[PDB]
Amino acid sequence: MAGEQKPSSNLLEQFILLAKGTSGSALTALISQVLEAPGVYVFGELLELANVQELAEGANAAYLQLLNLFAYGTYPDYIANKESLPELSTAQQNKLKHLTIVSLASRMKCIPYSVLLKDLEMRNLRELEDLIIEAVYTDIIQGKLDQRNQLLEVDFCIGRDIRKKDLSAIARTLQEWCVGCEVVLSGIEEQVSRANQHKEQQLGLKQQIESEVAN
Amino acid sequence: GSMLIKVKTLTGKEIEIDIEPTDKVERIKERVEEKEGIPPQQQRLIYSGKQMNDEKTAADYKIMGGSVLHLVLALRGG
Amino acid sequence: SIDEIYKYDKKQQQEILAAKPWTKDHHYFKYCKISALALLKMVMHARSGGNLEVMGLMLGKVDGETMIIMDSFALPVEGTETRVNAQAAAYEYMAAYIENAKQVGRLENAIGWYHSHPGYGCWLSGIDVSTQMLNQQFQEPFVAVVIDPTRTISAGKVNLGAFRTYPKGYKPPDEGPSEYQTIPLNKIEDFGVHCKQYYALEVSYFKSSLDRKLLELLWNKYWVNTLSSSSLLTNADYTTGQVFDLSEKLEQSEAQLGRGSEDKLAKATRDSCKTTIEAIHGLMSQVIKDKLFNQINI
Amino acid sequence: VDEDRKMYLQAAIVRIMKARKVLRHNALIQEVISQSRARFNPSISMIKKCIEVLIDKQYIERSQASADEYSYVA
Amino acid sequence: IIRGNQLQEFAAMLMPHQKATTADGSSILDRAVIEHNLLSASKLYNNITFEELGALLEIPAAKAEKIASQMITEGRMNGFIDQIDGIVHFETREALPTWDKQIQSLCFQVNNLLEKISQTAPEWTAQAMEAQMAQ
Amino acid sequence: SVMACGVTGSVSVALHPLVILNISDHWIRMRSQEGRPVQVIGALIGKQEGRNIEVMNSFELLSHTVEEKIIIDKEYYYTKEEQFKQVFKELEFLGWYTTGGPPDPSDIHVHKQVCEIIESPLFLKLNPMTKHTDLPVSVFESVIDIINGEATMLFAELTYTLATEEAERIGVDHVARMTSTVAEHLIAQHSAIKMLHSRVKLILEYVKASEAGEVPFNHEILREAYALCHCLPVLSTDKFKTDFYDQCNDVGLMAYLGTITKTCNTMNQFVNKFNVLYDRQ
Ligand SMILES: [Zn+2]
């Protein structure tokens, strides 16, 4: 319905009315069709509904595990936690791989190939850059293949998930560093209001001296 | 402008302009374009089958009131 | 009021227009009240003019002891700096404009000469000194409104001079500025022939409070553009032309001070320091952006 | 009559074409008609060819803007 | 980037003189498709070798670099090479280029979120406006 | 209130800032002529850069009162442009500014009036008689679509900046301050940065509220902040590191030569006065 970065736009009121009316096993079908929603793998205001709250910790408590994985966890979590979460499709298993990998490139300028080969259990170049190119092909990834650094060049990242909340701490760390660079640059500003304002005064007075030298 | 000459397009558009008896047709071009949007560099000023130098005075070619400063000029301006 | 000077009293303005104080003293006009239309298309049409010299009619008025430039700008033309009375040919512009400008209450009339020497000024050269002198004996109050486009590019300040040239018979009195300026070979001789036949007007600027608020708010989102210049890449070649020109000027300062254009060595030291300052401040802004955005470490 | 009129016209035509660049196709040919009202009745078509003749000599070029409405060159 | 029997059905769309095909056996449209294919790969990618990109394209690395040099025997190619190291290269566009890339990248990203919330919080738009007038 | 909520056009022109001042100046002109804040018209032009609009240059016009409506005296404006298109050919009539409250059917009407010289023109609204803290410029543009069986145009707003001309910027810096030239330079930096600073600070404020309380919990808030913190210092790369060694070494040896220029001019004057008093120059 609404439109910015998100999965298939049906999903919002789609799963609103689904969890509203589909519950238990109908809630499981709800979840199964939730599973393919990439840009919203996390449902903060969609788990706002008590229907998803019973989705969570109901029969599908493992699915709330998976949802928080999207919010918090990674696919390599599943590589360890192969049984904790609900089932996933190979497409969706690679989707959780893309979870952790978009989070990684979110971290670094460019994540190494071997990094995701190992954490995401990726064996070889072929499948590696297959899922890589499909991630970039989602257009989440700008930049290019950082082969020489054995990385992936990254110029732009679309938001992966809703990623339940460091939100407060996130925005306040943002406020912190914003103000920090601001104050660095503002100390510069007033050093400028010193120096070549001092340059104005200095040369003005020096020229006064030179003019008074005559008579 | 003391000299009130005519700048004429290929179709005969003779324009009344105030210039001087030493007024540069270099700036007479400026005048024709500042007056008619038709810019002067395809307002090729030709005098009697032979071009008028874009860098000259109108009166250099004994140009006067009913004299003609050729455009060949453009249509989109007009 | 801040709008008290934007008031174009066509009564008062055209009154002092017909006042002819210059025929009593050709040094009456000491001020030049300007609205920023001069700066507007003077600047961006000397720059958009590339290197093509231009000419025409300025909007304006007169106030007290003040010429007033409501307008000055360029053409998409050439030939100025060498035309026999260039400017005239663009007056057709406000041969029409001002006329039905009165239809909107722009009851102003024509006052001056818009122009630009793209890259090397806005003035009247040797043949245009014929222009300037003849026309000030033709058209006084007349001005040599002088600002250089590429000088105002690598300079950061608008050296505006309203140069009412000293008419034939009227010599520079106590106040003749006569802004000496480095001229190409075409007109430097005739500038030496006529460098001291003009004075400058005290060119002030007038506006509204809305004008100031608009410029501040301009900056208030242009600062992002400020940190996105990349102009060291822009005219590094311009710096190179200055390289050659400066080694040349030191050659000529050499040739002057050899045995015996005044003291080309000192003038050359001056201009060298100047242009180096120019390139250095360009590098300043660029290193500014660089160190800022490149010292942002995660 | 046909060869001497054609020669007289080539010169009158190039000279116009240098003076003002019309230059259009259609309007141009019409204006050409206007200049030589006295001479004789020309072909409305061949208007095309007319400009064509001047296109070759490096006298006037063909602009991008229209099949008509070209530009003057040289 | 679609593959062989992903559109071998397009064989049915083709024409007999066209379904009569080329010397190397990649038909006229096949290699056309490879121009198309690799062009996608090309416009995409930074730098790759030819055992890499040939196994990618299921084809000889010989052919890969070979007909690369042919792909520029068109002159529709842009990039550069090492024959010996057997590599082609993306470019990192690195600099001032990438600088303003993500400069105005963040500009649009920030203004996207700004006006998203200004429309989701036009009331809070007014409130933030109030506090910023205080600012 | 017949407006139509649409999309972009064909804007790109060049700018100088006193024509913004001539937005001011037409309002002052018609106001002094009528003794009242006059809802005026003015010939908007601007930059069009990809998907960005920049509504910049618009001076005095003719705004007649047709019984309630602002009116571009259309053929009057035709006269006017031919009165300046001779020499102002570097600028094209993008739209019209005015002065009043929000956009009204008279503003819609003269915007349509601007929609008759071209197909998709722009709309600007200024007012010194309105009551905002922002730079008073509203900017509208057009789609053509089908709704409720009616085929209609569509006019909606997009955001701008202002010109980037060198001497223009210098004049902006002065006429803002009107007194130190990079100071007269960096204050354009300061102004734009403070403007977007208010922007992303309002962002910061309603953001902080999100995590605080009573303000909507969305997952698309900070998330972008994560993107930002991975947008940190671009090009660590050593590429630009060498590049900037290059740049600063160039300018610095330039300055070194200028240590040359300065002290050599000093030296020549010294040799002069040495040839002045020690010698017969
Ligand atoms: Zn002259």
Residue numbers in the entry:
A (entry chain G): 1 to 215
B (entry chain N): 1, 100 to 176
C (entry chain E): 24 to 283, 296 to 333
D (entry chain O): 672 to 745
E (entry chain D): 272 to 406
F (entry chain F): 29 to 207, 215 to 316
What do the authors say?
The CRL2 E3 ligase consists of a Cullin 2 (CUL2) scaffold in association with a catalytic RING-box protein (RBX1), with the substrate adaptors Elongin B (ELOB) and C (ELOC) at its N-terminal. Activation of CRL2, in common with other members of the CRL family, involves a cascade of E1, E2 and E3 enzymes, which conjugate the ubiquitin-like protein NEDD8 (N8) to residue K689 on the CUL2 scaffold.
In line with subpopulation observations from our cryo-EM, we identified subcomplexes of the CSN–CRL2~N8 missing the CSN5, VHL, ELOB or ELOC subunits. This type of behaviour may allow the CRL2 to adapt to individual substrates and substrate receptors which vary in size and geometry as has been suggested with the CRL4A system. An interface between CSN1–ELOB can also be seen in the partial structures of CSN–CRL2~N8 missing VHL and CSN5/CSN6.
